[PDB]
Amino acid sequence: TRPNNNTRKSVRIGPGQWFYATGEIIGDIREAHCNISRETWNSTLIQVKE
Amino acid sequence: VRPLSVALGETARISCGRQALGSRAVQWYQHRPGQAPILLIYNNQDRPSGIPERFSGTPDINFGTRATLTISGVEAGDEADYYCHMWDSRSGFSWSFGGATRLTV
Amino acid sequence: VQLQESGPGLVKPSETLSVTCSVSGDSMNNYYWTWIRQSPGKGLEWIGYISDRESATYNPSLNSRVVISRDTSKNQLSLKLNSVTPADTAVYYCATARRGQRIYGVVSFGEFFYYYSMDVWGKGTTVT
Numbered sequence: 001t002r003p004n005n006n007t008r009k010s011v012r013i014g015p016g017q018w019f020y021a022t023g024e025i026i027g028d029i030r031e032a033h034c035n036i037s038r039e040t041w042n043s044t045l046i047q048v049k050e
Numbered sequence: 051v052r053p054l055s056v057a058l059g060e061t062a063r064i065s066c067g068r069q070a071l072g073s074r075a076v077q078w079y080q081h082r083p084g085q086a087p088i089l090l091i092y093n094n095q096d097r098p099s100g101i102p103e104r105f106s107g108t109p110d111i112n113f114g115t116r117a118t119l120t121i122s123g124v125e126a127g128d129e130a131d132y133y134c135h136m137w138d139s140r141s142g143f144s145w146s147f148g149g150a151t152r153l154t155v
Numbered sequence: 156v157q158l159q160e161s162g163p164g165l166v167k168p169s170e171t172l173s174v175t176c177s178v179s180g181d182s183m184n185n186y187y188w189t190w191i192r193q194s195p196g197k198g199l200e201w202i203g204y205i206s207d208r209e210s211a212t213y214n215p216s217l218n219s220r221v222v223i224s225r226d227t228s229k230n231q232l233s234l235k236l237n238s239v240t241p242a243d244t245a246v247y248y249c250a251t252a253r254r255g256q257r258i259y260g261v262v263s264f265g266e267f268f269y270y271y272s273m274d275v276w277g278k279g280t281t282v283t
């Protein structure tokens with residue numbers, strides 16, 4: 001996940017060329033994280049050990 | 051310092067002097083002059099014992115909900131000064147109480 | 156939980172204001188402690204709070220001229236305030252603090268902030 005709410009800001013840089021940057025962030029400044037279980041990853045590594 | 055006038059029996063809506071960015075935890079205080087302040091709401095809905103159920107606040111469900119103290123069935127004992135003490139995730143430590151609301155019915 | 160304070164009432168400018176608050180009923184180890192000021196015509200101003208291991212953080216607005224101290228030998232909360240001004244002529248209240256922790260994200264990432272809630276208060280004493 002990327003659990004912080006970001007707004008897309010369109011910046012004019014040329015004729016037809018539109019630069020889409022990150023606008024004002026609202027909500028909570030939170031880190032992007034991934035939950036790779038713990039129980040399945042225990043048995044996966046053990047079968048990697050064998 | 052902000053006057054608000056409501057009639058008897060109505061639901062009083064006290065808005066905070068500061069607005070919400072991000073997740074919040076708002077504390078509400080009642081301050082009669084010459085009397086001790088009393089805790090009404092902590093963690094944005096929890097009401098300690100001794101506070102009647104007339105006093106209520108909005109829960110923190112998602113973003114955009116304005117922090118408002120609800121006084122249903124206002125009595126003569128609610129004449130005081132009401133405080134919104136706000137914490138949030140981006141302004142850091144909230145050293146100041148913010149603006150004070152002078153309530154007179 | 157009852158808190159009863161007592162102060163000197165009047166000092167000359169740049170002297171130390173010392174108020175002594177007696178706390179009775181419960182143990183000292185279970186709560187955080189604080190001091191509250193209320194200027195006349197203005198709001199409530201925090202002046203600081205004390206921790207269990209004698210660590211105090213002060214207001215950037217007050218420019219760190221306030222010292223909050225603690226003496227557990229006689230079961231009381233202490234205060235000292237030097238470099239006083241006529242703007243410090245105010246009503247002082249004593250209270251305790253409960254450190255609340257509102258989680259909004261992952262705990263292991265430090266995605267949380269601490270807040271304090273004040274449940275019991277003193278009666279207030281006026282010094283000039």
Ligand SMILES: *[C@@H]1O[C@H](CO)[C@@H](O[C@@H]2O[C@H](CO)[C@@H](O[C@@H]3O[C@H](CO[C@H]4O[C@H](CO)[C@@H](O)[C@H](O[C@H]5O[C@H](CO)[C@@H](O)[C@H](O)[C@@H]5O)[C@@H]4O)[C@@H](O)[C@H](O[C@H]4O[C@H](CO)[C@@H](O)[C@H](O)[C@@H]4O[C@H]4O[C@H](CO)[C@@H](O)[C@H](O)[C@@H]4O)[C@@H]3O)[C@H](O)[C@H]2NC(C)=O)[C@H](O)[C@H]1NC(C)=O
Binds near residue numbers: 093111
């Ligand atoms: C990858 O894994 C990590 C690890 O789990 C995940 O990180 C988690 O992220 C979530 C984000 O939502 C965190 O949830 C938050 O938890 C807060 C604390 O919850 C604990 O305390 C409360 C109150 O004491 C208890 O009720 C909770 O118990 C409940 O949840 C557990 C979860 O299993 C159940 O088992 C229980 O049975 C209960 O059901 C916890 O003990 C929690 O307060 C917070 O929810 C509030 O905040 C959100 C956002 O502001 C609001 O939308 C929401 O409505 C809640 O607001 C109410 O509660 C607050 C309480 O202060 C009030 O003030 C409000 O007014 C309102 O009433 C939120 O849910 C979770 O803690 C965290 N895990 C860890 C270990 O830290 C990642 O998400 C995950 N990623 C992916 C992609 O999966």
Ligand SMILES: *[C@@H]1O[C@H](CO)[C@@H](O[C@@H]2O[C@H](CO)[C@@H](O)[C@H](O)[C@H]2NC(C)=O)[C@H](O)[C@H]1NC(C)=O
Binds near residue numbers: 024
């Ligand atoms: C990023 O910096 C810009 C600098 O221009 C900020 O934009 C202004 O911010 C001030 C607040 O100091 C506002 O009063 C203006 O209205 C803003 N102007 C515009 C055009 O947005 C912007 O707010 C900053 N963003 C973040 C997230 O800090």
Ligand SMILES: *[C@@H]1O[C@H](CO)[C@@H](O[C@@H]2O[C@H](CO)[C@@H](O)[C@H](O)[C@H]2NC(C)=O)[C@H](O)[C@H]1NC(C)=O
Binds near residue numbers: 035
């Ligand atoms: C990843 O998230 C998904 C949900 O998007 C989880 O999958 C479901 O989880 C619920 C409750 O946890 C179960 O009732 C469903 O049966 C699950 N569905 C499937 C298809 O598995 C999943 O458990 C999450 N995994 C981790 C490691 O967090």
Ligand SMILES: *[C@@H]1O[C@H](CO)[C@@H](O[C@@H]2O[C@H](CO)[C@@H](O)[C@H](O)[C@H]2NC(C)=O)[C@H](O)[C@H]1NC(C)=O
Binds near residue numbers: 005007027113
């Ligand atoms: C993520 O950001 C978008 C855009 O800033 C939010 O959409 C707005 O939400 C507010 C209320 O928070 C509404 O008043 C606006 O009308 C919405 N605008 C649009 C274009 O949808 C969105 O709610 C945010 N989501 C979260 C979870 O914070």
Ligand SMILES: *[C@@H]1O[C@H](CO)[C@@H](O)[C@H](O)[C@H]1NC(C)=O
Binds near residue numbers: 039042
């Ligand atoms: C991981 O697996 C081993 C062997 O299967 C087990 O002894 C251990 O308790 C497991 N740990 C966790 C955290 O599940």
